Amino acid sequence: SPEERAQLCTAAEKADELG
Amino acid sequence: SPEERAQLCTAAEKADELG
Ligand SMILES: *Cc1cccc(C*)c1
Numbered sequence: 001s002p003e004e005r006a007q008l009c010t011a012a013e014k015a016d017e018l019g
Numbered sequence: 020s021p022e023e024r025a026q027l028c029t030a031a032e033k034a035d036e037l038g
Contacts, residue, residue, distance in 0.1 A: 008031030
């Protein structure tokens with residue numbers, strides 16, 4: 001599910017940015 | 020939130036494996 005991964009990556013990527 | 024990212028990465032990583 002590449003699409004699911006992409007969405008999750010955003011959350012993980014965004015979460016990392018937040019701290 | 021590195022910890023949040025790690026958890027999300029697993030979901031994204033696992034999701035990718037599923038397809
Ligand atoms: C979007 C993403 C890139 C590299 C590693 C993770 C877990 C997520």
